[PDB]
mmCIF file of all heavy atoms in Angstrom:
data_model
loop_
_atom_site.group_PDB
_atom_site.id
_atom_site.type_symbol
_atom_site.label_atom_id
_atom_site.label_comp_id
_atom_site.label_asym_id
_atom_site.label_seq_id
_atom_site.Cartn_x
_atom_site.Cartn_y
_atom_site.Cartn_z
ATOM 1 N N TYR A 1 -173.452 33.670 106.785
ATOM 2 C CA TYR A 1 -174.912 33.688 106.813
ATOM 3 C C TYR A 1 -175.407 32.252 106.971
ATOM 4 O O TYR A 1 -175.831 31.598 106.019
ATOM 5 C CB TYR A 1 -175.463 34.351 105.556
ATOM 6 C CG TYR A 1 -174.755 35.639 105.199
ATOM 7 C CD1 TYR A 1 -173.753 35.660 104.238
ATOM 8 C CD2 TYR A 1 -175.087 36.833 105.827
ATOM 9 C CE1 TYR A 1 -173.101 36.834 103.911
ATOM 10 C CE2 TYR A 1 -174.441 38.012 105.506
ATOM 11 C CZ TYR A 1 -173.450 38.007 104.547
ATOM 12 O OH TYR A 1 -172.803 39.179 104.224
ATOM 13 N N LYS A 2 -175.349 31.763 108.207
ATOM 14 C CA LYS A 2 -175.773 30.402 108.496
ATOM 15 C C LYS A 2 -177.295 30.306 108.543
ATOM 16 O O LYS A 2 -177.998 31.296 108.764
ATOM 17 C CB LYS A 2 -175.180 29.928 109.823
ATOM 18 C CG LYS A 2 -175.535 30.811 111.011
ATOM 19 C CD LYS A 2 -175.001 30.231 112.312
ATOM 20 C CE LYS A 2 -175.651 28.891 112.622
ATOM 21 N NZ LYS A 2 -177.129 29.012 112.763
ATOM 22 N N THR A 3 -177.800 29.094 108.325
ATOM 23 C CA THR A 3 -179.235 28.854 108.404
ATOM 24 C C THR A 3 -179.695 28.933 109.854
ATOM 25 O O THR A 3 -179.195 28.204 110.717
ATOM 26 C CB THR A 3 -179.583 27.490 107.811
ATOM 27 O OG1 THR A 3 -178.907 26.460 108.543
ATOM 28 C CG2 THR A 3 -179.164 27.423 106.351
ATOM 29 N N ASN A 4 -180.647 29.821 110.121
ATOM 30 C CA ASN A 4 -181.143 30.071 111.472
ATOM 31 C C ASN A 4 -182.577 29.560 111.561
ATOM 32 O O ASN A 4 -183.489 30.133 110.958
ATOM 33 C CB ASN A 4 -181.056 31.556 111.814
ATOM 34 C CG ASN A 4 -181.128 31.815 113.304
ATOM 35 O OD1 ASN A 4 -180.706 30.986 114.110
ATOM 36 N ND2 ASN A 4 -181.662 32.972 113.679
ATOM 37 N N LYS A 5 -182.771 28.474 112.313
ATOM 38 C CA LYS A 5 -184.111 27.924 112.486
ATOM 39 C C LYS A 5 -184.989 28.860 113.308
ATOM 40 O O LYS A 5 -186.199 28.959 113.072
ATOM 41 C CB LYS A 5 -184.034 26.546 113.142
ATOM 42 C CG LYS A 5 -183.133 25.563 112.411
ATOM 43 C CD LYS A 5 -183.576 25.375 110.971
ATOM 44 C CE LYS A 5 -182.664 24.405 110.239
ATOM 45 N NZ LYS A 5 -181.256 24.887 110.204
ATOM 46 N N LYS A 6 -184.396 29.558 114.276
ATOM 47 C CA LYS A 6 -185.124 30.511 115.103
ATOM 48 C C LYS A 6 -185.288 31.837 114.368
ATOM 49 O O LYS A 6 -185.074 31.904 113.152
ATOM 50 C CB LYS A 6 -184.412 30.717 116.443
ATOM 51 C CG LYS A 6 -182.980 31.207 116.325
ATOM 52 C CD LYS A 6 -182.262 31.136 117.663
ATOM 53 C CE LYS A 6 -182.954 31.991 118.711
ATOM 54 N NZ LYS A 6 -182.941 33.432 118.340
ATOM 55 N N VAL A 7 -185.693 32.883 115.094
ATOM 56 C CA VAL A 7 -185.915 34.188 114.482
ATOM 57 C C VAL A 7 -184.670 34.632 113.723
ATOM 58 O O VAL A 7 -183.539 34.493 114.202
ATOM 59 C CB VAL A 7 -186.326 35.214 115.554
ATOM 60 C CG1 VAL A 7 -185.319 35.237 116.695
ATOM 61 C CG2 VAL A 7 -186.487 36.600 114.945
ATOM 62 N N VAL A 8 -184.881 35.161 112.519
ATOM 63 C CA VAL A 8 -183.792 35.531 111.622
ATOM 64 C C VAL A 8 -183.186 36.856 112.059
ATOM 65 O O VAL A 8 -183.758 37.575 112.887
ATOM 66 C CB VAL A 8 -184.280 35.605 110.164
ATOM 67 C CG1 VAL A 8 -184.840 34.260 109.723
ATOM 68 C CG2 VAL A 8 -185.323 36.702 110.007
ATOM 69 N N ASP A 9 -182.025 37.186 111.507
ATOM 70 C CA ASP A 9 -181.299 38.407 111.805
ATOM 71 C C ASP A 9 -181.504 39.427 110.693
ATOM 72 O O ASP A 9 -181.796 39.060 109.548
ATOM 73 C CB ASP A 9 -179.800 38.123 111.977
ATOM 74 C CG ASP A 9 -179.520 37.104 113.063
ATOM 75 O OD1 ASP A 9 -180.300 37.041 114.037
ATOM 76 O OD2 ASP A 9 -178.520 36.366 112.943
ATOM 77 N N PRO A 10 -181.371 40.721 110.995
ATOM 78 C CA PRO A 10 -181.533 41.725 109.931
ATOM 79 C C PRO A 10 -180.380 41.742 108.943
ATOM 80 O O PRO A 10 -180.585 42.072 107.767
ATOM 81 C CB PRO A 10 -181.640 43.047 110.708
ATOM 82 C CG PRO A 10 -181.969 42.651 112.119
ATOM 83 C CD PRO A 10 -181.287 41.338 112.327
ATOM 84 N N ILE A 11 -179.170 41.394 109.385
ATOM 85 C CA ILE A 11 -178.000 41.486 108.515
ATOM 86 C C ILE A 11 -178.091 40.476 107.377
ATOM 87 O O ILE A 11 -177.822 40.804 106.215
ATOM 88 C CB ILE A 11 -176.711 41.302 109.336
ATOM 89 C CG1 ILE A 11 -176.624 42.367 110.432
ATOM 90 C CG2 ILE A 11 -175.488 41.361 108.432
ATOM 91 C CD1 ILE A 11 -175.377 42.268 111.283
ATOM 92 N N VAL A 12 -178.470 39.233 107.687
ATOM 93 C CA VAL A 12 -178.581 38.216 106.644
ATOM 94 C C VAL A 12 -179.699 38.572 105.670
ATOM 95 O O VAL A 12 -179.592 38.324 104.463
ATOM 96 C CB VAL A 12 -178.780 36.821 107.270
ATOM 97 C CG1 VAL A 12 -179.995 36.801 108.185
ATOM 98 C CG2 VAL A 12 -178.898 35.757 106.188
ATOM 99 N N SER A 13 -180.775 39.186 106.168
ATOM 100 C CA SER A 13 -181.858 39.603 105.283
ATOM 101 C C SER A 13 -181.408 40.722 104.353
ATOM 102 O O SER A 13 -181.719 40.709 103.154
ATOM 103 C CB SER A 13 -183.071 40.039 106.105
ATOM 104 O OG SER A 13 -182.767 41.168 106.905
ATOM 105 N N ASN A 14 -180.674 41.703 104.886
ATOM 106 C CA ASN A 14 -180.154 42.780 104.051
ATOM 107 C C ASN A 14 -179.167 42.246 103.021
ATOM 108 O O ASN A 14 -179.081 42.758 101.899
ATOM 109 C CB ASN A 14 -179.501 43.855 104.921
ATOM 110 C CG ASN A 14 -180.505 44.603 105.778
ATOM 111 O OD1 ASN A 14 -180.314 44.760 106.983
ATOM 112 N ND2 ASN A 14 -181.582 45.067 105.155
ATOM 113 N N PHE A 15 -178.405 41.213 103.389
ATOM 114 C CA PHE A 15 -177.489 40.598 102.434
ATOM 115 C C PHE A 15 -178.246 39.874 101.328
ATOM 116 O O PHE A 15 -177.907 40.003 100.146
ATOM 117 C CB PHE A 15 -176.545 39.638 103.158
ATOM 118 C CG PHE A 15 -175.725 38.781 102.234
ATOM 119 C CD1 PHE A 15 -174.621 39.304 101.580
ATOM 120 C CD2 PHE A 15 -176.054 37.452 102.023
ATOM 121 C CE1 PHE A 15 -173.864 38.518 100.731
ATOM 122 C CE2 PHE A 15 -175.301 36.663 101.175
ATOM 123 C CZ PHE A 15 -174.205 37.196 100.529
ATOM 124 N N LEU A 16 -179.274 39.104 101.694
ATOM 125 C CA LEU A 16 -180.017 38.338 100.697
ATOM 126 C C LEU A 16 -180.810 39.251 99.769
ATOM 127 O O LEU A 16 -180.969 38.945 98.582
ATOM 128 C CB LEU A 16 -180.945 37.335 101.383
ATOM 129 C CG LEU A 16 -180.275 36.203 102.166
ATOM 130 C CD1 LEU A 16 -181.318 35.259 102.747
ATOM 131 C CD2 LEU A 16 -179.287 35.446 101.293
ATOM 132 N N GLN A 17 -181.316 40.371 100.284
ATOM 133 C CA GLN A 17 -182.097 41.290 99.467
ATOM 134 C C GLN A 17 -181.237 42.163 98.561
ATOM 135 O O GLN A 17 -181.787 42.904 97.741
ATOM 136 C CB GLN A 17 -182.969 42.185 100.354
ATOM 137 C CG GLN A 17 -182.198 43.255 101.106
ATOM 138 C CD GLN A 17 -183.093 44.110 101.982
ATOM 139 O OE1 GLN A 17 -182.625 45.026 102.657
ATOM 140 N NE2 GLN A 17 -184.388 43.814 101.973
ATOM 141 N N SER A 18 -179.912 42.094 98.688
ATOM 142 C CA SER A 18 -179.020 42.887 97.849
ATOM 143 C C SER A 18 -178.747 42.247 96.494
ATOM 144 O O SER A 18 -177.962 42.804 95.719
ATOM 145 C CB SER A 18 -177.697 43.130 98.577
ATOM 146 O OG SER A 18 -177.054 41.905 98.885
ATOM 147 N N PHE A 19 -179.361 41.107 96.187
ATOM 148 C CA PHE A 19 -179.162 40.414 94.915
ATOM 149 C C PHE A 19 -180.300 40.679 93.940
ATOM 150 O O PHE A 19 -180.686 39.793 93.173
ATOM 151 C CB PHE A 19 -178.998 38.916 95.149
ATOM 152 C CG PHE A 19 -177.733 38.546 95.872
ATOM 153 C CD1 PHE A 19 -177.689 38.530 97.256
ATOM 154 C CD2 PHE A 19 -176.590 38.209 95.166
ATOM 155 C CE1 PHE A 19 -176.527 38.189 97.923
ATOM 156 C CE2 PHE A 19 -175.426 37.865 95.827
ATOM 157 C CZ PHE A 19 -175.395 37.855 97.208
ATOM 158 N N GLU A 20 -180.858 41.892 93.951
ATOM 159 C CA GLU A 20 -182.004 42.193 93.096
ATOM 160 C C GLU A 20 -181.639 42.085 91.620
ATOM 161 O O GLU A 20 -182.427 41.587 90.808
ATOM 162 C CB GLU A 20 -182.553 43.582 93.430
ATOM 163 C CG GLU A 20 -181.515 44.698 93.452
ATOM 164 C CD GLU A 20 -181.343 45.368 92.104
ATOM 165 O OE1 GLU A 20 -182.172 45.118 91.204
ATOM 166 O OE2 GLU A 20 -180.380 46.148 91.943
ATOM 167 N N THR A 21 -180.435 42.535 91.253
ATOM 168 C CA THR A 21 -180.025 42.480 89.852
ATOM 169 C C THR A 21 -179.823 41.043 89.390
ATOM 170 O O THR A 21 -180.252 40.671 88.290
ATOM 171 C CB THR A 21 -178.748 43.293 89.647
ATOM 172 O OG1 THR A 21 -178.962 44.642 90.085
ATOM 173 C CG2 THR A 21 -178.350 43.303 88.178
ATOM 174 N N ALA A 22 -179.177 40.218 90.219
ATOM 175 C CA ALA A 22 -178.973 38.818 89.867
ATOM 176 C C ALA A 22 -180.304 38.082 89.757
ATOM 177 O O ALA A 22 -180.490 37.240 88.872
ATOM 178 C CB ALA A 22 -178.067 38.145 90.897
ATOM 179 N N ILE A 23 -181.246 38.393 90.652
ATOM 180 C CA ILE A 23 -182.558 37.753 90.605
ATOM 181 C C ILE A 23 -183.324 38.180 89.361
ATOM 182 O O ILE A 23 -183.978 37.355 88.711
ATOM 183 C CB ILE A 23 -183.347 38.061 91.894
ATOM 184 C CG1 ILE A 23 -182.705 37.357 93.091
ATOM 185 C CG2 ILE A 23 -184.803 37.649 91.749
ATOM 186 C CD1 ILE A 23 -183.343 37.705 94.418
ATOM 187 N N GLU A 24 -183.254 39.463 89.003
ATOM 188 C CA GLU A 24 -183.949 39.944 87.813
ATOM 189 C C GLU A 24 -183.367 39.316 86.549
ATOM 190 O O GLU A 24 -184.103 38.807 85.698
ATOM 191 C CB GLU A 24 -183.876 41.470 87.743
ATOM 192 C CG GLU A 24 -184.763 42.184 88.748
ATOM 193 C CD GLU A 24 -184.619 43.691 88.684
ATOM 194 O OE1 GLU A 24 -183.800 44.178 87.876
ATOM 195 O OE2 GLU A 24 -185.325 44.390 89.441
ATOM 196 N N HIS A 25 -182.044 39.347 86.411
ATOM 197 C CA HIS A 25 -181.393 38.841 85.208
ATOM 198 C C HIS A 25 -181.170 37.333 85.229
ATOM 199 O O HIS A 25 -180.685 36.787 84.233
ATOM 200 C CB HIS A 25 -180.055 39.555 84.994
ATOM 201 C CG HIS A 25 -180.192 41.011 84.676
ATOM 202 N ND1 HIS A 25 -180.663 41.933 85.587
ATOM 203 C CD2 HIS A 25 -179.921 41.706 83.545
ATOM 204 C CE1 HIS A 25 -180.675 43.132 85.032
ATOM 205 N NE2 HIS A 25 -180.229 43.021 83.793
ATOM 206 N N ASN A 26 -181.508 36.651 86.322
ATOM 207 C CA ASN A 26 -181.302 35.205 86.401
ATOM 208 C C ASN A 26 -182.239 34.647 87.466
ATOM 209 O O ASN A 26 -182.099 34.979 88.647
ATOM 210 C CB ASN A 26 -179.848 34.881 86.721
ATOM 211 C CG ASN A 26 -179.567 33.392 86.717
ATOM 212 O OD1 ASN A 26 -179.596 32.740 87.762
ATOM 213 N ND2 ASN A 26 -179.294 32.844 85.539
ATOM 214 N N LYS A 27 -183.184 33.802 87.048
ATOM 215 C CA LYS A 27 -184.125 33.211 87.993
ATOM 216 C C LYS A 27 -183.468 32.175 88.895
ATOM 217 O O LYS A 27 -183.890 32.019 90.047
ATOM 218 C CB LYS A 27 -185.302 32.574 87.248
ATOM 219 C CG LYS A 27 -186.402 33.549 86.837
ATOM 220 C CD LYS A 27 -185.982 34.430 85.669
ATOM 221 C CE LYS A 27 -187.086 35.401 85.286
ATOM 222 N NZ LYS A 27 -186.683 36.274 84.150
ATOM 223 N N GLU A 28 -182.440 31.476 88.405
ATOM 224 C CA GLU A 28 -181.776 30.440 89.190
ATOM 225 C C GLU A 28 -181.141 30.977 90.466
ATOM 226 O O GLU A 28 -180.746 30.178 91.323
ATOM 227 C CB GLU A 28 -180.708 29.737 88.343
ATOM 228 C CG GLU A 28 -181.254 28.917 87.182
ATOM 229 C CD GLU A 28 -181.635 29.764 85.982
ATOM 230 O OE1 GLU A 28 -181.418 30.994 86.024
ATOM 231 O OE2 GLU A 28 -182.150 29.200 84.994
ATOM 232 N N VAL A 29 -181.027 32.299 90.612
ATOM 233 C CA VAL A 29 -180.513 32.866 91.855
ATOM 234 C C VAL A 29 -181.488 32.615 92.998
ATOM 235 O O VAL A 29 -181.085 32.451 94.156
ATOM 236 C CB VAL A 29 -180.221 34.367 91.673
ATOM 237 C CG1 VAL A 29 -179.596 34.953 92.931
ATOM 238 C CG2 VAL A 29 -179.314 34.587 90.472
ATOM 239 N N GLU A 30 -182.791 32.573 92.692
ATOM 240 C CA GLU A 30 -183.790 32.363 93.740
ATOM 241 C C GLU A 30 -183.659 31.000 94.411
ATOM 242 O O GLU A 30 -183.594 30.948 95.652
ATOM 243 C CB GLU A 30 -185.193 32.596 93.167
ATOM 244 C CG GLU A 30 -185.562 34.060 92.980
ATOM 245 C CD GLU A 30 -185.917 34.747 94.285
ATOM 246 O OE1 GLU A 30 -185.997 34.059 95.324
ATOM 247 O OE2 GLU A 30 -186.120 35.979 94.273
ATOM 248 N N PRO A 31 -183.619 29.873 93.687
ATOM 249 C CA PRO A 31 -183.441 28.589 94.383
ATOM 250 C C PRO A 31 -182.062 28.424 94.995
ATOM 251 O O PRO A 31 -181.913 27.684 95.975
ATOM 252 C CB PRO A 31 -183.694 27.549 93.281
ATOM 253 C CG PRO A 31 -184.398 28.289 92.192
ATOM 254 C CD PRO A 31 -183.833 29.666 92.243
ATOM 255 N N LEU A 32 -181.048 29.093 94.448
ATOM 256 C CA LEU A 32 -179.681 28.981 94.937
ATOM 257 C C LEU A 32 -179.264 30.172 95.793
ATOM 258 O O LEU A 32 -178.066 30.373 96.016
ATOM 259 C CB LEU A 32 -178.707 28.815 93.767
ATOM 260 C CG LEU A 32 -178.600 27.430 93.118
ATOM 261 C CD1 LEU A 32 -178.421 26.352 94.178
ATOM 262 C CD2 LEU A 32 -179.793 27.124 92.222
ATOM 263 N N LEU A 33 -180.223 30.970 96.271
ATOM 264 C CA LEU A 33 -179.880 32.087 97.146
ATOM 265 C C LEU A 33 -179.312 31.603 98.473
ATOM 266 O O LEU A 33 -178.437 32.258 99.048
ATOM 267 C CB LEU A 33 -181.107 32.969 97.380
ATOM 268 C CG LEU A 33 -180.874 34.270 98.148
ATOM 269 C CD1 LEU A 33 -179.851 35.139 97.433
ATOM 270 C CD2 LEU A 33 -182.180 35.024 98.341
ATOM 271 N N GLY A 34 -179.792 30.465 98.971
ATOM 272 C CA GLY A 34 -179.232 29.896 100.176
ATOM 273 C C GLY A 34 -177.835 29.350 99.956
ATOM 274 O O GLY A 34 -177.346 29.246 98.829
ATOM 275 N N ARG A 35 -177.180 29.020 101.074
ATOM 276 C CA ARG A 35 -175.827 28.449 101.122
ATOM 277 C C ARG A 35 -174.841 29.196 100.221
ATOM 278 O O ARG A 35 -173.843 28.624 99.770
ATOM 279 C CB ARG A 35 -175.831 26.945 100.800
ATOM 280 C CG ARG A 35 -176.122 26.556 99.357
ATOM 281 C CD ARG A 35 -176.065 25.051 99.167
ATOM 282 N NE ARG A 35 -176.448 24.657 97.814
ATOM 283 C CZ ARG A 35 -175.608 24.603 96.786
ATOM 284 N NH1 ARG A 35 -174.332 24.918 96.951
ATOM 285 N NH2 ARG A 35 -176.046 24.233 95.589
ATOM 286 N N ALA A 36 -175.095 30.476 99.965
ATOM 287 C CA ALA A 36 -174.190 31.311 99.177
ATOM 288 C C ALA A 36 -173.251 32.084 100.099
ATOM 289 O O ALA A 36 -173.276 33.313 100.191
ATOM 290 C CB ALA A 36 -174.989 32.253 98.280
ATOM 291 N N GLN A 37 -172.404 31.326 100.790
ATOM 292 C CA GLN A 37 -171.526 31.882 101.810
ATOM 293 C C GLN A 37 -170.312 32.532 101.146
ATOM 294 O O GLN A 37 -170.254 32.695 99.924
ATOM 295 C CB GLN A 37 -171.139 30.794 102.806
ATOM 296 C CG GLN A 37 -172.324 29.998 103.335
ATOM 297 C CD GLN A 37 -173.287 30.843 104.151
ATOM 298 O OE1 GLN A 37 -172.913 31.877 104.704
ATOM 299 N NE2 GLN A 37 -174.539 30.403 104.226
ATOM 300 N N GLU A 38 -169.323 32.917 101.949
ATOM 301 C CA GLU A 38 -168.188 33.688 101.456
ATOM 302 C C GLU A 38 -167.038 32.755 101.092
ATOM 303 O O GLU A 38 -166.353 32.234 101.977
ATOM 304 C CB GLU A 38 -167.739 34.709 102.502
ATOM 305 C CG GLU A 38 -166.589 35.596 102.053
ATOM 306 C CD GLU A 38 -166.162 36.585 103.119
ATOM 307 O OE1 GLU A 38 -166.736 36.552 104.228
ATOM 308 O OE2 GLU A 38 -165.253 37.398 102.849
ATOM 309 N N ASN A 39 -166.828 32.545 99.796
ATOM 310 C CA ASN A 39 -165.693 31.768 99.316
ATOM 311 C C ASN A 39 -164.437 32.626 99.385
ATOM 312 O O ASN A 39 -164.384 33.704 98.782
ATOM 313 C CB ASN A 39 -165.930 31.285 97.885
ATOM 314 C CG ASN A 39 -167.191 30.452 97.750
ATOM 315 O OD1 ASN A 39 -168.103 30.804 97.003
ATOM 316 N ND2 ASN A 39 -167.246 29.339 98.470
ATOM 317 N N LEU A 40 -163.431 32.154 100.118
ATOM 318 C CA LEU A 40 -162.228 32.937 100.392
ATOM 319 C C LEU A 40 -161.144 32.542 99.391
ATOM 320 O O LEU A 40 -160.404 31.578 99.597
ATOM 321 C CB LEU A 40 -161.762 32.734 101.832
ATOM 322 C CG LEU A 40 -162.729 33.199 102.922
ATOM 323 C CD1 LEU A 40 -162.157 32.919 104.302
ATOM 324 C CD2 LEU A 40 -163.048 34.676 102.760
ATOM 325 N N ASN A 41 -161.057 33.300 98.301
ATOM 326 C CA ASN A 41 -159.999 33.107 97.325
ATOM 327 C C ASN A 41 -158.655 33.521 97.921
ATOM 328 O O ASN A 41 -158.606 34.225 98.933
ATOM 329 C CB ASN A 41 -160.299 33.911 96.060
ATOM 330 C CG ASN A 41 -160.677 35.346 96.358
ATOM 331 O OD1 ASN A 41 -161.379 35.624 97.328
ATOM 332 N ND2 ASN A 41 -160.212 36.268 95.521
ATOM 333 N N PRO A 42 -157.544 33.076 97.321
ATOM 334 C CA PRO A 42 -156.222 33.447 97.853
ATOM 335 C C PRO A 42 -156.005 34.944 98.013
ATOM 336 O O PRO A 42 -155.307 35.360 98.947
ATOM 337 C CB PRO A 42 -155.259 32.846 96.823
ATOM 338 C CG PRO A 42 -155.985 31.661 96.302
ATOM 339 C CD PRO A 42 -157.439 32.052 96.264
ATOM 340 N N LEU A 43 -156.590 35.769 97.141
ATOM 341 C CA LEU A 43 -156.391 37.214 97.239
ATOM 342 C C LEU A 43 -156.973 37.767 98.534
ATOM 343 O O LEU A 43 -156.309 38.524 99.253
ATOM 344 C CB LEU A 43 -157.015 37.910 96.028
ATOM 345 C CG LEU A 43 -156.279 37.771 94.694
ATOM 346 C CD1 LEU A 43 -157.107 38.360 93.563
ATOM 347 C CD2 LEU A 43 -154.920 38.447 94.768
ATOM 348 N N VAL A 44 -158.216 37.397 98.849
ATOM 349 C CA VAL A 44 -158.875 37.939 100.035
ATOM 350 C C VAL A 44 -158.189 37.456 101.305
ATOM 351 O O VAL A 44 -157.939 38.242 102.228
ATOM 352 C CB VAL A 44 -160.373 37.581 100.022
ATOM 353 C CG1 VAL A 44 -161.000 37.865 101.378
ATOM 354 C CG2 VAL A 44 -161.090 38.364 98.936
ATOM 355 N N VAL A 45 -157.866 36.163 101.380
ATOM 356 C CA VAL A 45 -157.225 35.640 102.584
ATOM 357 C C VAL A 45 -155.822 36.219 102.735
ATOM 358 O O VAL A 45 -155.357 36.467 103.854
ATOM 359 C CB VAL A 45 -157.217 34.098 102.570
ATOM 360 C CG1 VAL A 45 -156.373 33.566 101.427
ATOM 361 C CG2 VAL A 45 -156.719 33.556 103.901
#
């Protein structure tokens, strides 16, 4: 989910809007919602 200066994509928006529980239970998710890319732990890779 890279930063897109031009018109945004629906997939990144659907991904960002899926953090409703984290946003409700933690306000710091809002300022740190960006740059929350996919960290590839050894298990996933």
Side-chain angles (χ1 to χ4, degrees):
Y1 314 98
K2 57 176 296 300
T3 60
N4 198 30
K5 305 303 179 300
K6 58 191 300 297
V7 53
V8 301
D9 302 329
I11 301 180
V12 56
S13 63
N14 292 131
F15 170 77
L16 294 182
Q17 73 181 180
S18 60
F19 292 87
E20 51 90 11
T21 303
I23 291 175
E24 287 178 358
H25 293 67
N26 184 265
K27 278 74 181 180
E28 293 79 3
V29 184
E30 283 284 353
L32 282 311
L33 187 58
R35 71 179 175 86
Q37 311 296 336
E38 182 181 2
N39 302 120
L40 297 179
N41 49 321
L43 286 173
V44 167
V45 64

